[PDB]
Design an enzyme around this catalytic site. Structure first.
Site, short mmCIF file in Angstrom:
data_model
loop_
_atom_site.label_atom_id
_atom_site.label_comp_id
_atom_site.label_asym_id
_atom_site.label_seq_id
_atom_site.Cartn_x
_atom_site.Cartn_y
_atom_site.Cartn_z
N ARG A 127 2.68 15.22 -7.37
CA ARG A 127 2.23 15.16 -5.88
C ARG A 127 1.68 13.76 -5.60
O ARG A 127 1.87 13.02 -4.63
CB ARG A 127 1.27 16.31 -5.27
CG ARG A 127 1.04 16.57 -4.00
CD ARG A 127 2.00 15.75 -2.93
NE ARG A 127 3.19 16.56 -3.00
CZ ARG A 127 4.45 15.98 -2.44
NH1 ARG A 127 4.61 14.70 -2.02
NH2 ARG A 127 5.39 16.52 -2.59
N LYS A 152 -7.52 -14.68 18.62
CA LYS A 152 -7.15 -13.58 19.37
C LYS A 152 -7.76 -13.40 20.75
O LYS A 152 -8.49 -14.55 21.14
CB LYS A 152 -7.49 -12.19 18.40
CG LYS A 152 -7.01 -12.21 17.25
CD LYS A 152 -7.51 -10.89 16.19
CE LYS A 152 -6.45 -10.42 15.38
NZ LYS A 152 -4.95 -10.04 16.14
O1 LIG Z 1 -4.73 -10.12 12.51
C1 LIG Z 1 -3.81 -10.26 11.96
O2 LIG Z 1 -3.71 -10.36 10.73
C2 LIG Z 1 -2.47 -9.80 12.65
C3 LIG Z 1 -1.27 -10.64 12.49
C4 LIG Z 1 -0.24 -10.34 12.93
C5 LIG Z 1 -0.07 -9.28 14.15
N1 LIG Z 1 -1.26 -8.42 14.12
C6 LIG Z 1 -2.43 -8.62 13.73
C7 LIG Z 1 -3.44 -7.76 13.98
O3 LIG Z 1 -3.92 -6.82 12.93
O4 LIG Z 1 -4.32 -7.89 15.00
O1 LIG Z 2 0.65 22.05 -2.46
C1 LIG Z 2 0.08 22.46 -1.35
O2 LIG Z 2 -1.01 22.31 -0.92
C2 LIG Z 2 1.34 22.63 -0.11
C3 LIG Z 2 0.80 23.26 0.67
C4 LIG Z 2 1.83 23.84 1.96
C5 LIG Z 2 2.96 23.15 1.82
N1 LIG Z 2 3.24 22.04 1.05
C6 LIG Z 2 2.54 21.72 0.16
C7 LIG Z 2 2.84 20.78 -1.03
O3 LIG Z 2 3.47 21.25 -2.16
O4 LIG Z 2 2.74 19.77 -0.89
#
Ligand SMILES: O=C(O)c1cccnc1C(=O)O
Ligand SMILES: O=C(O)c1cccnc1C(=O)O
Ligand SMILES: [Cl-]
Ligand SMILES: [Cl-]
Ligand SMILES: [Cl-]
Ligand SMILES: [Cl-]
Ligand SMILES: [Cl-]
Lengths: 297, 296
Positions: free
Chosen positions: A116, A183
């Site tokens: 997982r 920004k």
């Molecule tokens: O701040 C940055 O690095 C940035 C750069 C490009 C686009 N969005 C962001 C943002 O998370 O506001």
């Molecule tokens: O393992 C779990 O907790 C689980 C519970 C419900 C549905 N899927 C999962 C999974 O195998 O990821």
């Protein structure tokens, strides 16, 4: 259930261009989320401690694969090196349904503990790379590239930036301190966009520098000031066409980056305006996961 | 800063947020942003004594989650030197323009905190928003929605929190708090009902959910009277049959469907008659809610 992994794994990570200390923090944390309530009760009742099996990691959907070295690190840490790999694809490869990204052999109980955590990393980083790769495609035929941003999920920044690279996109800055990006709120709290750009150039002349404009009036100032890179914030496709006109007439040495209000459908229209870059937060904050599963022999 | 005020320490506990786990997430996320320097941009353009009011509001409709965590970010960065004018509660539905928070702090501290706060807000609210959408589709049935272990690394407890705030129910939290006999246990363990009997054997008070892939396996575990069966990737039609076979056998086994579920077919699966839907998409594929932070 180990301290850290073998330097054989550290070499595998830095070879792929993954920050190994950050990968370790992510992997150790993710294992602890699963193990903090006790041992795998289900496996302990149903699977002999001596069992060994082969496992195949395969995708159900098509897309781009990222994170296989980090998935391998998870498995190294849980088995303490006692695993043998038979087959693997490389991060960056396209995958179709049924394609085998990894075939490995280890103790059955340890695979059941690792799977997982391996798959959550793998399915998430692959989703990022898969989506980045979609955006790159909408930009085929033009000269426009796609970049990510700082809108990454808590704890997974370097890994999400890596996945963006594996999907054919480009990273923006990694933090508040490795580059300047002026920004809206910097301009709200301060004078004007032009004043702000002059202030950052004067205060920190080494770092690369980009200013984010929300109108064409602001765009005019930073063009007059000869800005190195300009970010157009929620420009329409027509507004960008105007911005590319005004840029081409002044300093053709100014990169225009569009950001805000971008979706995969309109990505092609924007690229055609002649802007150089699209900055897409969705790459890392709304990347749907790629369906990969782990099956036993 | 080091830790946060005991006031945010207890506002988190009042929310049902694991406060130790929040500290790790918050401090990690801040270190991600500051490990390169000090925020050259703000230090060049914002006065070192400026103080501003900031509003967090959403551009799109959804359920809000994580506001106590976003507040704890602000606390750490300001050292407690901030004040809240207004705040909505995790769980409230918001619409465009709806203000989830109004704070006042030093402008430079707000700019360092802004992006970590919003990354937490937008992700968790996204998780709660998708969960709430799933809840709507299940409305008018007795089916509830549940999460999985398919969480983003490092974010399990906050995401489970947000599933609760979006109106869903948590499944188990790790490998040690519940039994869930999966596809691979069955491979390694010969048979589906062989594995279920082994689970009852080892700890008889711990309840076993067994995960089947065929209608045959479902008869096998219904014959052993399994407490709870999970139908892995049954079609809407296979679930209807699954419910029929379950209603025949005199055990009231609980039926949870999982595997591939999309919002798309959510409302249909809720009407097969199964009792639960386990949706990995709530946490591994939740689109972020567009909240922004704007200055006066
Ligand atoms: O701040 C940055 O690095 C940035 C750069 C490009 C686009 N969005 C962001 C943002 O998370 O506001
Ligand atoms: O393992 C779990 O907790 C689980 C519970 C419900 C549905 N899927 C999962 C999974 O195998 O990821
Ligand atoms: Cl690279
Ligand atoms: Cl088009
Ligand atoms: Cl609760
Ligand atoms: Cl049958
Ligand atoms: Cl039982």
């Amino acid at each position: 259930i180990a301290e850290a992994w073998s330097p054989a794994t550290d070499e595998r990570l830095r070879a792929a261009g993954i920050d190994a200390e950050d990968a370790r923090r992510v992997v150790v944390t993710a294992l602890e989320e699963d193990l903090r309530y006790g041992a795998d009760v289900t496996s302990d009742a149903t699977v002999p401690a001596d069992a060994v099996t082969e496992a195949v990691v395969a995708s159900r959907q098509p897309g781009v694969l990222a994170g296989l070295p980090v998935a391998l690190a998870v498995l190294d840490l849980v088995t303490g090196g006692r695993f043998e790999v038979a087959e693997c694809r490389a991060d960056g490869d396209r995958l179709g349904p049924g394609d085998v990204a990894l075939r490995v052999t280890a103790a059955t109980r340890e695979l059941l503990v690792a799977e997982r955590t391996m798959l959550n990393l793998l399915c998430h980083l692959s989703g990022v790379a898969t989506l980045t790769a979609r955006w790159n495609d909408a930009l085929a035929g033009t000269h426009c590239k796609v970049r990510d941003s700082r809108k990454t999920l808590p704890g997974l920044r370097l890994l999400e930036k890596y996945a963006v690279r594996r999907g054919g996109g480009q990273n923006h800055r990694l933090g508040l301190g490795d580059a300047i990006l002026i920004k809206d709120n910097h301009i709200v709290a301060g004078g004007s966009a032009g004043a702000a750009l002059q202030a950052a150039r004067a205060h920190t002349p080494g770092l690369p520098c980009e200013v984010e404009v929300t109108t064409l009036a602001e765009l005019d100032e930073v063009l007059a000031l000869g800005a190195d890179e300009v970010m157009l914030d929620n420009f329409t496709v027509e507004q960008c066409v105007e911005a590319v006109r005004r840029r081409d007439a002044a300093r053709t040495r100014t990169r225009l980056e569009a950001s805000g209000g971008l979706t995969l459908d309109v990505a092609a229209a924007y690229a055609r305006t002649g802007v150089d870059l699209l900055a897409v937060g969705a790459l890392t904050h709304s990347a749907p996961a790629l369906d990969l599963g782990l099956d036993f022999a």
